[PDB]
């Protein structure tokens, strides 16, 4: 069921913005680890005396890394005279966010038809405003409302290159890395209580629940009209034997925030070979692999979609597989991206549901909670 109840026209995921203490070092680590190119910048070299912002791209995926400068550099500016390229940026907010949460996502940005319209409708329907709409160079409109914790949902609309005031990167410094990642598939929040959070977000977006198919989580997924913008939310299940990983997140994060970003690859096998090659030389580590029992059990579950060779390939790389009614999902998770056990990344590829491919095809892998436990205990034998 899809009531298609979006309250404003929503296009696609546009970008993700991390708030950090040093944008240079985080951006350079991510570039090498994930194979994303340096595409644009707004820093001192471009006249921005307020914040250092660096943009990484892979296909249509945009990761923006931003950090503050000393406020003394821009102490004489006022908002009408600012040199910031992101008018919503605030020194105090950024330092407070990062000291409270450590490294993580500040903005989930989606492209809309009319950022001004989306903002007003949103707050008309209960959104807590964060940054009012601003028109950049008469060409781009940007606005922000609260999503959960200190994460904002950013609207971005274009009348007709990333943002005004950003310069393209002189390719000499812009090495064309590419491990196969292509777009952002979904962005997941952790909250203490799922009910009030879902009611708030679906309330002002009109997004509908996507509908799915003991391990410490309850969760639900909001979706836009064509189900291409996907925003799942988790809450802790307390009192179980094994401590909830959602509760651990809220503890070490100082409350709600974004849990994982799921990046779609055009060839998950090559993405995972390339990332694993780099895990120990500046890249990302992956969660411990499932036991061979898990892969011996895959023939019965997806032996009609993946060849026996394609299953052995999953086993070498530690990929997980799940399946709903309409298609199949290959997935794998990184260890946390930073010091704290909080944000992590998921790499995914979806098989099926062709009309183009419809969003959510195969679900989100909840069936791998039980299957992982099962295969672990079979292998304990």
- The residues that touch its own copies, with contacts defined as CB under 8 A, are 20-26, 28-29, 31-33, 43-44, 52, 67, 69-70, 72-73, 95, 98-100, 102-103, 172-175, 177, 251-252, 254, 279-283, 285, 337-341
Q: Select the binding partner of residue 98 from Co ion, its own copies, ligand NV0, none (C-beta < 5 to 8 A, by kind).
A: its own copies
- The encoded tokens of residue 261 equal 């970003």
Q: Select the binding partner of residue 73 from Co ion, its own copies, ligand NV0, none (C-beta < 5 to 8 A, by kind).
A: its own copies
Sign of CA dihedral 119, 231, 17, 166: negative
CB of 16 to its own copies, least distance (A): 16
Residue 51 annotated as part of some ligand binding site = no
Residue 364 in contact with ligand NV0, rule: CB under 6 A: yes
**What is the rounded distance in angstroms from the CA atom of residue 13 to the CA atom of residue 32?**
23
**What is the rounded distance in angstroms from the CA atom of residue 35 to the CA atom of residue 283?**
9
- All residues at 6 or more sequence positions from 233 whose CB lies less than 8 Å from its CB, including other chains: 148, 188, 189, 190, 191, 194, 197, 198, 201, 219, 220, 221, 222
CB of 249 to its own copies, least distance (A): 12
In this chain, which stretch among 53-61, 130-138, 167-175, 367-375 interacts with ligand NV0, using CB under 6 A?
A: 367-375
Residue where the block lists tokens 């056990």: 341
Q: Select the binding partner of residue 219 from Co ion, its own copies, ligand NV0, none (C-beta < 5 to 8 A, by kind).
A: ligand NV0
Residue 194 in contact with ligand NV0, rule: CB under 6 A: no
> 232 with 220: CB under 8 angstroms?
yes
Number of residues that bind Co ion (CB under 5 A): 3
CB of 210 to ligand NV0, least distance (A): 9
Start-to-end C-alpha separation, the chain: 42
Q: Select the binding partner of residue 354 from ligand NV0, Co ion, its own copies, none (C-beta < 5 to 8 A, by kind).
A: none
Indicate the residue among 99 and 326 with the shorter CB distance to ligand NV0.
326
Q: Which of 125, 192, 333, 352 binds ligand NV0 (CB under 6 A)?
A: 333
**What is the rounded distance in angstroms from the CA atom of residue 272 to the CA atom of residue 265?**
10
Strand bridging mode 257-265 / 344-352 = parallel
Largest CA distance in the chain: 69
Footprint of ligand NV0 on 264-293 (CB under 6 A): 287
In this chain, which stretch among 42-50, 297-305, 352-360, 361-369 interacts with ligand NV0, using CB under 6 A?
A: 361-369
Residue 262 in contact with Co ion, rule: CB under 5 A: yes
Residue 138 annotated as part of some ligand binding site = no
> 37 with 26: CB under 8 angstroms?
no
Other beta carbons within 10 angstroms of residue 211's beta carbon come to 13
> 341 with 252: CB under 8 angstroms?
yes
Q: Which of 351, 352, 334 is nearest to 343 (CA)?
A: 334
CB of 75 to its own copies, least distance (A): 12
């Amino acid at each position: 069921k899809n009531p298609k109840s979006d309250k404003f026209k929503v296009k696609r995921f546009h970008h993700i913005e991390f708030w950090c203490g040093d944008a240079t070092n985080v951006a350079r680590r991510f570039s090498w680890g994930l194979g994303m190119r340096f595409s644009a910048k707004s820093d001192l070299s471009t006249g921005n005396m307020v914040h250092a912002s660096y943009l990484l791209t892979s296909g249509d995926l945009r990761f923006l890394f931003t950090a503050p400068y000393s406020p003394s550099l821009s102490a004489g500016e006022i908002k009408p005279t600012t040199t910031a390229s992101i008018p919503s940026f605030d020194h105090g907010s950024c330092r407070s966010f990062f000291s409270s949460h450590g490294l993580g996502v500040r903005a989930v940005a989606i492209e809309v038809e009319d950022a001004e319209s989306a903002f007003s409708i949103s707050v008309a329907n209960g959104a807590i405003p964060s940054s009012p709409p601003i028109v950049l160079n008469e060409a781009v409109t940007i606005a922000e409302v609260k999503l959960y914790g200190d994460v904002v949902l950013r609207y971005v609309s274009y009348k007709a290159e990333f943002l005004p005031g950003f310069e393209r990167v002189e390719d000499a410094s812009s090495f064309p890395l590419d491990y196969g990642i292509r777009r952002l598939d979904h962005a997941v929040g952790n909250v203490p209580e799922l009910g009030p959070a879902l009611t708030y977000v679906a309330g002002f977006t009109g997004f509908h629940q996507f509908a799915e198919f003991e391990s410490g989580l309850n969760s639900a997924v909001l979706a836009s009209n064509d189900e291409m913008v996907l925003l799942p939310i988790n809450e802790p299940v307390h009192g179980t034997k094994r401590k909830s990983q959602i509760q651990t997140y809220l503890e070490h994060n100082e409350g709600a925030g974004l849990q994982h970003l799921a990046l779609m690859s055009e060839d998950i096998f090559r993405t995972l070979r390339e990332m694993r090659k780099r895990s120990s030389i500046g890249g990302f580590d992956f969660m411990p692999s499932p036991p061979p029992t898990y892969y011996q059990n895959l023939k019965k579950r997806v032996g009609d979609v993946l060849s026996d060779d394609q299953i052995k390939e999953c086993e070498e790389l530690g990929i997980l597989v799940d399946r709903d009614d309409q298609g199949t999902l290959l997935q794998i998770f990184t260890k946390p991206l930073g010091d704290r056990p909080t944000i992590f990344i998921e790499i995914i590829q979806r098989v099926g549901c062709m009309m183009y491919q419809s969003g959510g095809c195969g679900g989100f892998g909840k069936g791998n909670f039980s299957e992982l436990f099962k295969s672990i205990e079979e292998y304990e034998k």
